């Protein structure tokens, strides 16, 4: 239970993110930490990755959803690990709240540029609005390409290799 080994730092001045759903207020702050090229603390990052595993591993391998006649869904495609585009759509088409039940067709580690930060925010939003926010796997997405496009190196640069095992 590496999360309960403490070793907290808050060099980022980061709020504690609990095992309960991440507050929107921080998520807005996290988007600002991307406007400012700033990163999460490790115990919070480990704790969200644990929770993300626990929810995602139970979701059906084909996702089934009924869209009511009066309801509208915004559908999204390849992002190549740049958050700037989703930054804007969230701000433009409404933040990905229950009123913006987005579906994202994967391809986030498709390339590395802000890609850790991309999945790190998407995985934040997925905990707060799991019913509305839906993530698929992309087609450029396996260890084979996590290596070719240096995402494995981003992880190994920012964190010790066990972090890459958890992300896997």
């Amino acid at each position: 239970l590496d999360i309960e080994s403490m070793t907290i730092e808050d060099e980022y001045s980061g709020p504690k993110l609990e095992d309960g759903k991440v507050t929107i207020s921080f998520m807005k702050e996290l988007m600002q930490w991307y406007k400012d090229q700033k990163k999460l603390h490790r115990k919070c990052a480990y704790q969200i990755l644990v929770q993300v595993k626990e929810v995602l591993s139970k979701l059906s391998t084909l996702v089934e959803t009924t869209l009511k006649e009066t309801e509208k869904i915004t559908v999204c495609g390849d992002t190549h690990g740049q958050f700037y585009d989703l930054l804007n759509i969230f701000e433009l088409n409404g933040l990905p709240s229950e009123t913006n039940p987005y579906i994202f067709n994967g391809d986030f580690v498709d390339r590395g540029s802000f890609s850790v930060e991309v999945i790190l925010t998407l995985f934040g939003f997925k905990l707060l609005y799991p019913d509305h926010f839906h993530l698929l796997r992309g087609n450029a997405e396996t260890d084979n390409m996590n290596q070719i496009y240096g995402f494995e190196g981003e992880v190994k640069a920012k964190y010790t290799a066990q972090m890459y095992e958890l992300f896997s």
Partner: protein, 60 residues
């Protein structure tokens, strides 16, 4: 912290060799060593941190 990490990974063998052979600078070289421990997980510690975390009953 990050430039040291890169350095250490590349040249930790040389520092460790220096402890072995250099009888005068062991005192300074030892503070450059970094190790994984049972209470640092996937991070590494200086020996000086090991010490600051020692219990009052530990004498070694």
């Amino acid at each position: 912290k990050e430039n040291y990490k890169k350095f250490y990974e590349a040249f930790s063998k040389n520092l460790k060799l220096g402890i072995h052979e250099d009888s005068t600078n062991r005192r300074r070289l030892s503070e450059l060593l970094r190790y994984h421990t049972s209470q640092s997980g996937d991070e590494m510690t200086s020996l000086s941190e090991y010490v600051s975390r020692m219990k009052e009953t530990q004498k070694s």
